[PDB]
Design a protein around this ligand. Structure first.
Ligand SMILES: O=C(Nc1cccc(Cl)c1)C(F)(F)F
Length: 460
């Protein structure tokens, strides 16, 4: 029974509007409705993993698990195993997997983050799940961000709090937040970014939606504009949106957008918006392909429509050799040549690097670099040919070329990371000096760059 090198992952996000679901929700899990939809010929083919995020979920965990599992069994004739379920207030994440995957899944973690302070603490935040699928780490975040058209900055702040404080994946990766801990990270939810057009244009926007003409609406979507200005979700991907805004509908039909201000809305307008989103970030040169991204048309209990996204995702096997795990393999080495970090910091400590990777027995600290001044004001930290030779546990190129090195640049004075990045070992050649590059971030914001050359020796 061979180990897979690809899986498919279903991601769902639905703000249920505090109402029970209708009796049939199968269109959601089938990626049917509007947008990039799944071929009818695939309807009986189960996804390997289903990750369901809800917001404003009124159900108990048990109630929702029974609906989800019975839905999937009706579609696929497979009884899915529950990997994890975690709820914060009315924000929930469920992970289901095909039974064949039970002994491929391990290291399951769950956590939550509550956003805001006093007034603004009490219903917004995020839940998440991580686990290993054979040799591949997977992370999943369902967030319900702050609502309201004039709170895009609060949403951006909610995002940074969630990525700083959500404790998922390998705790030994101490310098790294969730945006670096996983081979594949999926971040979805009621992100609550709005189409930023004047209130007076509500009926114009509705007209455009009825004509399926989204371009002049998407050019005002706050999440796209904030992402293009590097204010949020730096280094994440999103499929092109080709479905109608998923909020705010009159319940029990999809024929009407309910946008006008009401006491129940705090006297706020809810112009039609793409509140409900799926984004991802995968390590460099790992296979990830979005195969659906859309909304259902036939689930109408909520003022939001459910959103689906599906992905092909590359996975690796749990590799054993005669040597590692449990020792090094002397036929393997990773060398860094001519490396330097460019940092945006105004500070003047010395810096050292840490290299973290599950291809090493443990993380490696470098010597301090040599600080120089860049021609445009920058700090340049030079490592030269001084970096420690990395000793991987396994030399086989079928393993090593699929690995990644996480890099943190840390202050000698404080041992605090000033920037984190990731280098793929999926090189064009071995035993050959090749350029490498990663941007460096801290708290998910750009703090600099790391570049140089690599020389990878495998057993071949
Ligand atoms: O641990 C659970 N599930 C689980 C564990 C390992 C593999 C798989 Cl497939 C599922 C829980 F939370 F449901 F009890």
């Amino acid at each position: 029974q061979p180990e897979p090198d690809m899986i498919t992952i279903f991601i769902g996000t639905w703000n249920m509007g505090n109402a029970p679901p209708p009796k049939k929700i199968t269109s959601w899990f089938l990626s049917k409705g509007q947008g990039k939809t799944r071929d009818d010929s695939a309807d009986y083919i189960p996804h390997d993993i289903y990750v369901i995020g809800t917001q404003e979920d009124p159900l108990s965990e048990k109630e929702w698990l029974e609906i989800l599992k019975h839905s999937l069994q009706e579609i696929t004739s497979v009884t899915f195993k529950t990997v994890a379920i975690h709820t914060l207030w009315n924000i929930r994440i469920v992970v289901l997997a095909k039974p064949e995957h039970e002994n491929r899944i391990s290291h399951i973690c769950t956590d939550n983050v509550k956003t805001g302070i006093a007034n603004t603490l009490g219903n917004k935040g995020a839940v998440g799940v991580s686990f290993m699928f054979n040799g591949t780490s997977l992370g999943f975040v369902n967030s319900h961000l702050t609502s309201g058209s004039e709170k895009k900055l609060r949403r951006n702040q909610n995002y940074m709090n969630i990525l700083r404080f959500l404790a998922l994946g390998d705790k030994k990766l101490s310098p790294f937040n969730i945006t670096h801990r996983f081979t594949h990270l999926f971040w979805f939810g009621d992100l609550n970014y709005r189409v930023d057009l004047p209130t007076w244009e509500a009926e114009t926007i509705i007209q455009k939606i009825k004509q399926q003409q989204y371009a002049d609406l998407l050019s005002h979507d706050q999440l796209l504009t904030e992402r293009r200005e590097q204010k949020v979700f730096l280094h994440f991907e999103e499929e092109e949106i080709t479905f109608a805004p998923t909020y705010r509908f009159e319940r029990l039909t999809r024929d009407k957008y309910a946008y006008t201000k009401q006491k129940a809305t705090g006297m706020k307008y809810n112009l039609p918006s793409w509140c409900d989103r799926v984004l991802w970030k995968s390590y460099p040169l790992v296979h990830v392909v979005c195969q659906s991204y859309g909304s259902t048309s036939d689930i109408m209990t909520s003022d939001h429509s459910p959103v689906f996204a599906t992905f092909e995702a590359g996975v690796t096997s749990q590799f054993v050799s005669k040597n590692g795990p449990g020792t090094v393999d002397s036929q393997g080495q990773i060398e860094f040549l001519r490396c330097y970090a460019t940092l945006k910091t105004k500070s003047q400590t010395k810096f050292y690097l840490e290299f973290h990777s599950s291809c090493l027995e443990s993380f490696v600290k470098s010597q301090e670099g040599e600080n120089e001044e860049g021609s445009e004001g920058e700090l340049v930290v030079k490592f030269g040919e001084t970096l420690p030779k990395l000793k991987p546990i396994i030399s086989d190129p079928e393993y090593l070329l699929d690995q990644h090195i996480l890099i943190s640049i840390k202050s000698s004075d404080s041992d605090e990371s000033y920037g984190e990045g990731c280098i793929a070992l999926r090189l064009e050649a071995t035993e050959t000096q090749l350029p490498i590059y990663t941007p460096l971030t801290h708290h998910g914001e750009l703090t600099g760059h790391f570049q140089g050359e690599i020389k990878l020796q495998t057993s071949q």
